[PDB]
Amino acid sequence: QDADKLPHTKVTLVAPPQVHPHEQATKSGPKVVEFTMTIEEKKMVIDDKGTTLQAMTFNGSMPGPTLVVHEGDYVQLTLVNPATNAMPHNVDFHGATGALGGAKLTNVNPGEQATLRFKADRSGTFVYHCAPEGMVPWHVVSGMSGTLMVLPRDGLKDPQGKPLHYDRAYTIGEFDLYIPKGPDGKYKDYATLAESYGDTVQVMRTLTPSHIVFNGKVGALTGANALTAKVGETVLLIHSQANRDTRPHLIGGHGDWVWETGKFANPPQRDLETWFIRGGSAGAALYTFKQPGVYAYLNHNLIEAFELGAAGHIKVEGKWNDDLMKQIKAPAPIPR
Amino acid sequence: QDADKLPHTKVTLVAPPQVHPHEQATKSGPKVVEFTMTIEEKKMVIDDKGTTLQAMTFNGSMPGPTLVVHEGDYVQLTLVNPATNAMPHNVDFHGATGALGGAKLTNVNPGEQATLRFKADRSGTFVYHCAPEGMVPWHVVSGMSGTLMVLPRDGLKDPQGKPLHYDRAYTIGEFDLYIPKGPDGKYKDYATLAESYGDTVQVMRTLTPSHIVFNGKVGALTGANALTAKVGETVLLIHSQANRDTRPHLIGGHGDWVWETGKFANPPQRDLETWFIRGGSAGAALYTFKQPGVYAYLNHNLIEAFELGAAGHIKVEGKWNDDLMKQIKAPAPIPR
Amino acid sequence: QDADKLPHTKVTLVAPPQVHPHEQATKSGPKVVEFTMTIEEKKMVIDDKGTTLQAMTFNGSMPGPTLVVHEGDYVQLTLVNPATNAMPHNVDFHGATGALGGAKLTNVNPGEQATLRFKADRSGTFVYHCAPEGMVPWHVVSGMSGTLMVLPRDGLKDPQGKPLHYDRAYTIGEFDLYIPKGPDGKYKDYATLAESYGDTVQVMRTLTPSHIVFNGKVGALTGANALTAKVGETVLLIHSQANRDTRPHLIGGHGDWVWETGKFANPPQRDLETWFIRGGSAGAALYTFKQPGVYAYLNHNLIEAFELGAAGHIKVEGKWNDDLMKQIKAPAPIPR
Ligand SMILES: [Cu+2]
Ligand SMILES: [Cu+2]
Ligand SMILES: [Cu+2]
Ligand SMILES: [Cu+2]
Ligand SMILES: [Cu+2]
Ligand SMILES: [Cu+2]
Ligand SMILES: [Zn+2]
Ligand SMILES: [Zn+2]
Ligand SMILES: [Zn+2]
């Protein structure tokens, strides 16, 4: 026990899909790691036809940034709700024990801020999300979630206890969105956040999302914004879904080691084609690239991916390996 | 073999969320454990606006009571269908081998009763449900399911083979309900069970539940009816869903050890934030409370929980632990 | 490396639910295994009321046939798209590494054919499916998927490393179908494949299937077409779902050993009542029959099974075992 004896570090958060610099295995000791996050309500364009979402976010982004600590650290968050916002908010860390994830101790009306500490005594990727009483699903589906990664002190491990590592970490929040439609069957635009509410609840209750998006927008992780890697590189793909199940898949790739339930004291599974993230959870997959090219990373309900938007790209540099894959005969007429 | 050489015990069932008294590890030997259950059709109020369900139940409750035996025992059930009921019924134990779970050997018109025996040769929590030919989903979604827990003879075990135990067992049946609506868009009330049928089937086919409820009602496990524990206590949370997937989560807590597929010869997983119960199955989680307070136990599709009703509370007594969690700065104005 | 040094074998594919002859454990060495498949677009009757699907298939069947190799082999597929078809097509093997599963190297307009080779370096059942740019979900949901099983060289293994085997392999593709309805609320019939498109997309986007079917049709694996086994026999049930989650269950039976994620380097789970196939994946269960009779194999969302069609039968010959299950008292009046 006593956390007050311990050294402090301040961490500067970065925007998804990146994750702030951290060590995997560490020789360092339990610290009190300090973070600050600032809630921002805002309208966002979520697709290529100018449909908007009256959104709510931690730190301006969907998802919130990923916070990283080691098992044994103490997370200390200053949560700030500017008076420029319209709603109260709080925070529920699934990584934390007591007070409803910290939601009870972090209720912040606009103009307020609070500071929570909890011990990160359990390794894994864990969702955090806003949970204001009477209003939980709305705040979550409107964008208010992210990931806390608690790495084992000696870093990641395979089922045999052998070390595993990644060279690059990426963070993907998947967001099932419930955008209301007018009598004309066009999506509704709302002047304020409060005004989106009633109509939104009614779409939510149909359990049918209008949109399902990575990192805030259809196409968010495509084009200039595609993720990147090199043949030989190991990536950790962190995938959070605070409200609905999803099934990540890397087209042309695999999940070399996957913790689908996101909890690193458990052995991961290997060679996965498609894994499963349970709504209300974050999972983690390692992949070491072996072929160059553009890969698709997606929800493998293909409707949810291609029709609804749950899909991104990874652009991978390096040398083609004909042993792994070879075009023997290119497309050509069927021999007469 | 031969079951006829064996001693008999009669078990007196109790109503959910409690589970009848049983031993975990036992020095005792294979018995023929005798149970009796009586089907009851009845109208139930399922939410706080007086919406009713033309329900069908084992022993008067949703879910049915939980039956407990040890691996190697023989379950012997007398299933009674009173002439005061309108439908035939039977029973399908997923814990059992042959005759479609026992459904073929237990077809009981109103006024009849039958007695089934099967060997409980496989450990785990297992769903049982009514499965009358031509009418299976209807009977299941209208309430006719429950759990058979078959404990290992030497009790529960962690992945390393170390003993695990619970001090208190709770049983939660989650029920996706398909209540029809009138042209006025109000829920339909039906004078008889038979009359609910056609309209219900049509809602079912949309795969969109009107309600999703723990133990028969919205708010069933809240207020006076909240579950209870103490700091230091280990609870086993048994969660059945005979028809639809769900994703249990304990807010402010974890799944210390979880058998999401519900089968105790498999190693459980640890530190889970959210687990997954496959429709047609029962799972089991252990949690040892470390902080006092009211916890929410819920389906972490938050729409299904807060809008539709898949949520309950656990009221936990004891001493707050500031090491685990501490309000450093309560909500207060953002410093100018 | 070099695949060109290696011997070739030609495999003759068979129609589901059968799987072409293969060895489990093998003393043989890495070969280049050659397959050819021919795409066929066609109208199919999918239920007992003459509803049709403008379908697209590999080799004339839903699902495609199952291709079997051993870990270390090279799969070499000649994919043929006859000029009698209307669409371009390709193939994405989840078992393969690079070029989007091989989709990029296999784009075949009608009248063309291509040949792909990749190394099957990872054991498991893996989905393959057509993935033509701009048109992926449509081709997949209209029938274009199947399984590649890559067996370990020394065959299947339990979590302790002990050998496992099957005597009979069956392959089940489950297909969520999105059949449009007219203003009269009857299913739409389409003269051409291209004409089904726009309406189909709109049903897809509701994420509500009109039909969910094993192997192309409601009742496909029932009656004369039921699967078969004997008491004492071990079956491997391969279950693919290229687009949507499903939850296989064997009524009256179990999953003795189950790889729900379908990847044989992972330990399987035992005693499962219901397992979970993630959309975009194939899983595998072993079961050794202990009782004769007709079993139901189904998606245990019972609505999806009985209302929508995700259910088949297994007819099992042999001797009843009263130790496992016994009708103690048949149905008879409740004693006065
Ligand atoms: Cu909020
Ligand atoms: Cu939560
Ligand atoms: Cu019944
Ligand atoms: Cu069942
Ligand atoms: Cu195609
Ligand atoms: Cu795919
Ligand atoms: Zn590396
Ligand atoms: Zn205890
Ligand atoms: Zn055998």
Coordinates of C-alpha atoms in Angstrom, one line a residue, chain A residues 1-3 74 76 80-82 92 94-102 105 107-108 111-119 121-123 125-127 129 136-137 140 178 201 204-207 242-245 261 263 265-266 276 278-282, chain B residues 187 207-210 212 244-245 247 249 251-257 260 268-276 278 287-288 290-292 294-296 300-304 306-308 320-335:
Chain A
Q1 CA 0.0 0.0 0.0
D2 CA 0.6 3.7 0.6
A3 CA 0.6 5.5 -2.8
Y74 CA -1.6 4.6 -9.8
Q76 CA -4.2 10.1 -11.4
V80 CA -11.9 19.1 -16.7
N81 CA -15.4 20.1 -17.9
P82 CA -15.2 23.7 -19.4
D92 CA -15.7 5.3 -15.5
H94 CA -13.0 -0.2 -16.2
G95 CA -9.4 -0.6 -15.1
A96 CA -10.3 0.8 -11.7
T97 CA -12.0 -0.7 -8.5
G98 CA -14.8 1.1 -6.6
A99 CA -17.2 4.0 -7.0
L100 CA -18.6 2.7 -10.3
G101 CA -15.2 3.0 -12.1
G102 CA -14.7 6.5 -10.6
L105 CA -16.2 10.8 -7.6
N107 CA -19.2 14.3 -11.6
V108 CA -18.3 17.6 -13.2
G111 CA -17.1 25.1 -15.3
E112 CA -15.8 22.3 -12.9
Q113 CA -12.9 19.8 -12.7
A114 CA -12.1 16.9 -10.4
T115 CA -9.1 14.7 -9.7
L116 CA -9.3 10.9 -9.3
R117 CA -6.7 8.4 -8.3
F118 CA -7.0 4.6 -8.5
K119 CA -4.5 1.8 -8.5
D121 CA -3.6 -3.3 -10.3
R122 CA -4.7 -5.4 -13.3
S123 CA -3.0 -5.6 -16.7
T125 CA -6.5 -2.7 -22.3
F126 CA -9.5 -1.4 -20.5
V127 CA -12.2 1.0 -21.7
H129 CA -16.1 6.1 -20.6
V136 CA -25.1 6.8 -19.8
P137 CA -25.7 5.3 -23.3
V140 CA -21.0 6.9 -24.7
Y178 CA -27.5 6.5 -34.2
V201 CA -32.7 7.8 -28.0
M204 CA -30.8 3.9 -30.2
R205 CA -33.7 1.8 -29.1
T206 CA -34.0 0.2 -32.6
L207 CA -30.4 -1.1 -31.9
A242 CA -17.6 0.8 -25.4
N243 CA -21.2 -0.1 -26.5
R244 CA -21.5 -2.8 -29.2
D245 CA -19.7 -6.0 -30.3
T261 CA -10.9 -9.9 -24.0
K263 CA -6.5 -8.9 -20.4
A265 CA -2.5 -12.1 -17.5
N266 CA -4.4 -14.5 -19.8
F276 CA -14.2 -10.5 -31.2
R278 CA -17.3 -7.4 -26.7
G279 CA -19.2 -4.1 -26.4
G280 CA -18.0 -2.5 -23.2
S281 CA -14.4 -3.7 -23.7
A282 CA -11.0 -3.2 -25.4
Chain B
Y187 CA -47.8 -2.4 -26.1
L207 CA -34.7 -9.7 -34.1
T208 CA -35.3 -6.5 -32.1
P209 CA -36.4 -7.0 -28.5
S210 CA -38.9 -4.5 -27.0
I212 CA -34.3 -7.1 -22.3
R244 CA -29.5 -14.1 -27.4
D245 CA -25.9 -13.0 -26.8
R247 CA -22.1 -9.2 -22.4
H249 CA -20.1 -6.4 -16.8
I251 CA -19.3 -1.5 -12.9
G252 CA -16.6 -0.7 -10.4
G253 CA -15.6 -4.4 -10.4
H254 CA -14.2 -7.1 -12.6
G255 CA -14.5 -10.8 -13.4
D256 CA -11.7 -12.2 -11.2
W257 CA -12.2 -15.6 -12.8
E260 CA -17.6 -17.2 -20.3
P268 CA -11.2 -19.5 -16.7
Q269 CA -9.9 -16.1 -17.7
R270 CA -8.9 -13.4 -15.2
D271 CA -9.3 -9.7 -14.8
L272 CA -12.2 -9.4 -17.3
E273 CA -13.9 -6.1 -17.7
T274 CA -16.8 -7.5 -19.8
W275 CA -17.4 -11.1 -20.7
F276 CA -19.6 -12.7 -23.3
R278 CA -23.5 -16.8 -26.2
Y287 CA -15.7 -11.7 -8.0
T288 CA -14.2 -10.8 -4.5
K290 CA -12.7 -4.9 -2.3
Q291 CA -14.8 -1.7 -2.1
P292 CA -18.2 -1.0 -0.5
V294 CA -23.7 0.1 -4.9
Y295 CA -22.4 -1.7 -8.0
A296 CA -24.3 -2.1 -11.3
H300 CA -22.6 -3.7 -21.6
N301 CA -24.5 -2.8 -24.6
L302 CA -25.6 0.2 -22.7
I303 CA -28.7 0.7 -24.8
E304 CA -29.8 -2.8 -24.0
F306 CA -30.4 1.4 -19.6
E307 CA -33.0 1.8 -22.3
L308 CA -34.2 -1.8 -22.5
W320 CA -13.5 2.1 1.7
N321 CA -9.9 1.5 0.5
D322 CA -8.2 4.8 -0.5
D323 CA -5.2 2.8 -1.9
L324 CA -7.5 1.2 -4.6
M325 CA -9.3 4.5 -5.2
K326 CA -9.1 8.0 -3.9
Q327 CA -10.9 11.3 -4.7
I328 CA -7.9 13.5 -4.7
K329 CA -9.8 16.7 -5.5
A330 CA -13.6 16.7 -5.4
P331 CA -15.5 18.6 -8.2
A332 CA -14.8 22.3 -7.8
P333 CA -14.4 25.3 -10.2
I334 CA -11.7 25.3 -12.9
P335 CA -8.9 27.5 -11.5

